[PDB]
Assembly symmetry: D3
Homo-oligomer: 237 residues x 6
């Protein structure tokens, strides 16, 4: 076990899907995986392992924010033999043509966190996904007939920012979705030698003010999960 | 209701105790409060309201790290009329004379987070607790036969430090304990005009945890007078 | 003697009150201390030692700004056995409801100086006072009928700051008073293992109770700490 | 014309290959393109336009360093209608089994430059390539039977680093190649709304001290040019 | 030889003049130097060695931007025994009384580059010229009857700056000229123990005239070297 | 009068020499000035005005550190018509070839203070002296048979630094002397539109370990003051 996961090597698949919400992890396990078993509940951060079309797969919450997900992703990689992490999250949109419930794939993740500067001697570390994982997601989505845009996310430390003007800058630079984790997970993946990808579903739009309910975020963003799971199968070929 | 809290104004007391672990919040509610009711379970971040010695009190998890607890504390303050937040958590000690099971009260919280720099035009914001709450907690501990240490915490963004350079520096400048939240909560309290305090037990013991919760709850009653 | 203080161990009490102005130190010594003697005059930075209600006490100017007071406080702590430093100064208020002559106690001090970042590997060091000292001062003030405000100071490097809008930021985050030293003194205290406190009187409002009372508060606060 | 390019709209193709070395640009024009004509010589920064397998294509030097290539790529995007830029460069390797003449594709670019912080309110902008261009390069390389790793570059401001320890940090975080431009070009592409990709050839090894000659860098790194040109043809499809 | 300079110790004089444009280096060699010989052409960054009034002089382009000129100046100093470097460039003006064609001598160079912060542990390194060289340049200009201002340049990383407001800040602080190199050259000079100076002519305010003015700058630079030898 | 100077316009000359120690200002007034009179004593920061070779000259302490000297120099400039400020101080050396008693003229001043960053939008402001004042000082020193070094000072915020390694960095980039004021004075002069120069005598060494006599130090001090005073006369011509 590790300080935040009461499990043993073997309990997790070598690929883990990770939403921020452990309740979404539960819904995914119950809906998409066969023979699902709970493999963690420390701090209520539910994780499960099951099979999807014969392929062993795990799904576990990572909590909100870079510091939270950095803990779980590190633990999975060093102690549970996890090779790939697919974050399956929600994000806010700033772009006019990005719509509620759109699926976005974060090839890169910008951030206002200091964690990567701490890692990288105060220079700019480009927090990027694994290329093959990005391509597997894109191809899985095309096979599924689900649209998906690929580009930059922005991983914010403050969901409630005092600096509203930063959204104008994000939009200018083509940021697809604003969430709170991708850059941190990508940093961890680089530090500990694993592969990672963040896929998000647009749960609110910052300019139009539209949003989804907490219940909707918890269970209904299934397009991204299908993409994630099928991308794993492509990855195995 | 907010995106992160499925409740309405009135469901929370004006004072909220917050451990990181929502299961700890459940434990606190079931152990210390009368008539405990679950008032939030969005994302499993359990929140409860009940009474302690007749005083309305809430307890809810804040999750791990500055960004997580920043969300919950802001929403409680701006949407649920919360006036005081007391974080009740664990910390790792750095000093030789700061023993295991010691109670530490964070009058200040250092951090390697950028959030307060974002707030404060890239200058040094001293992230501090509300003094009356600190005094209340010190007095409540004394009444219970405990000498709490009062001083600086360090709120880390990285539980798993890439290099661990900061540990010796924290020791050098007299930091009492390392955790992952206080500096963020204090920033929120300052930003939105509320009062906050972080209390921790040195974990690097069900008695001392209970002791800390008793300190927090009794400190609130002191503040009410 | 140290590079900036021509005195020897024993010349200073283990508690030193420090105004920015050395002539204010002279005034405090003549007004409050019995059998006061001058113990330093290097650079005109007048220091004195005497007694207050029988308690040995020193008072000495620290000059203006973090770099200046950092020198004097370090030398006092490392070479003269000083355990407690109490800065007694004036500050500007940015909050509407803070009044002229309000007393402010800096439990913390924000700053735009780089000194604590240099100490703290470019992270945020929370520059704080010693809790017991803060409490002693609150209690001493209350005994005199004064409700001191307890919270953050901001220690500016520039008295003539080019960034007026920062004062709005200070107001938004609840800064009680603006001066030029607290954060530096608190960094020195942490660095060298001592205790410090800054008490200020509000002398003006930035942008569009007496001094003797403040000194009494600081001195009486020491007596409480002794008990 | 623009301040650094004496040419007119239409003189450049909508895709431009750019080495930092204008003499490599000249070699590429003479060697890979038919009917190539010089379209720029301002400051000796040679630019050419010709066809590759019937497709109009340009190649032009961008000079050494972020500030130099930022000027040229900006002027090309805003004033000559250029839609895609492919940097075709050289780089130093820090990883043990990245060897001389290996081709590396920068899906991202780290940097110690301040330019993106200036653009992005002092936060972390993830300087990334256009995904489709990355995939086109990967596919072209596969078709050509040429190996090419995809990952992070590091765009340095100081070829001669005072801080040698930074190479250890690059190595730790899996940096494939150290050059001096990708992150700047990616920042310009984002700022002015175009698409970019950096492909490099390993010209020296920072650890073993193996290195190629100035002549070899000028005129023998042809694998990366084949990939770049074939990838454009894929993108057109 | 170095990866960016195909030449050997001795091919260069111990003083090198450097415009950004290698073609202007070629012009200088051809115009003011005798017996000029091309000594570098890697990346087309032309370098020449000749004599001016009997004194061995080199001139070579440095390309655009701090990273570019930093490579050339470093290599000239460490591998080619170069002692003094004089940048002879163009700049943009932000001050009212600074006119097109004015000659500015950069005793200092401000910058928005991170290179000196990298050198100097994230503190403020004042990127300054060598005093004697500045004085030689001022004295030569006087001898030639050319007026010159001595002050701060600003070395910008982005010719196309997203931050329009910074030019107001430069003006407020008396920046004489905005170019893209001096601060980097000065950092190199300090790092490797050589001497440097940047002289610029104002080419913009943010034909035959530009010629005369360019020549004037070159004459100041060359004549200042002679003064420095004395 | 101003908040830190209880004097009236005309009480100061248009040139003010400024040592850190107000007692040194008194010494200078008594030793070099005719008909000296005290014109300030607020905070014990003694200032005097008199004549040197018939020329009106002032001398006033500035206290220790950037924040202290920034207050005094600003007030002299905006409210007392002061055009030139000459700091005359002591400094520590880091270079072995820089000897105790050397005279150093700070044409530039590096610093670890944030004050110039605050002024200059977080970029690098080169804190410099006025060129003519530097030249006047070099010439005055020559005429007195003294060879002054001209280059960079480093203005430190911390006389007792926790960062011992910074001295190696200073040495590496050729810093001549370490003091605590020059960069702040130069920042003020630039902000409020006056001219400044800092001259220092080397009084200690961080790397070497010579030791002088008080007699030698007073001679050298006097030498520096003569240089400052004579440099003013040169500038008047």
């Amino acid at each position: 076990a590790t300080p935040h996961i009461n499990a043993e090597m073997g309990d997790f698949a070598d690929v883990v899907l990770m939403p921020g919400d452990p309740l979404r992890a539960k819904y995914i396990a119950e809906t998409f995986l066969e023979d699902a078993r709970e493999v963690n509940n420390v701090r209520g951060m539910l994780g499960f392992t099951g099979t999807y079309k014969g392929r062993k797969i795990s799904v576990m919450g990572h909590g909100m924010g870079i510091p939270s997900c950095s803990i779980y992703t590190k633990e999975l990689i060093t102690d549970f033999g996890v090779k790939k992490i697919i974050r399956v999250g929600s994000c806010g949109a700033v772009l006019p043509h990005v719509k509620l419930r759109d699926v976005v794939i974060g090839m890169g993740a910008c951030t206002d966190s200091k964690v990567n500067r701490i890692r990288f001697k105060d220079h700019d570390f480009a927090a990027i996904a694994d290329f093959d994982m990005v391509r597997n997601a894109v191809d899985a989505a095309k096979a599924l007939g689900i649209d998906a845009r690929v580009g930059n996310l922005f991983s914010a430390d403050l969901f409630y920012s005092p600096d509203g003007e930063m959204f104008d800058v994000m939009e200018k630079y083509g940021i697809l979705g604003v969430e709170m984790e991708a850059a941190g997970i990508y940093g961890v993946a680089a530090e500990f030698g694993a592969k990672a990808l963040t896929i998000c579903t647009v749960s609110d739009h910052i300019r139009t003010h539209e949003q989804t309910t907490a219940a909707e975020r918890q269970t209904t963003f299934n397009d991204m999960i299908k993409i994630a799971l099928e991308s794993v199968l492509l990855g195995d070929k």
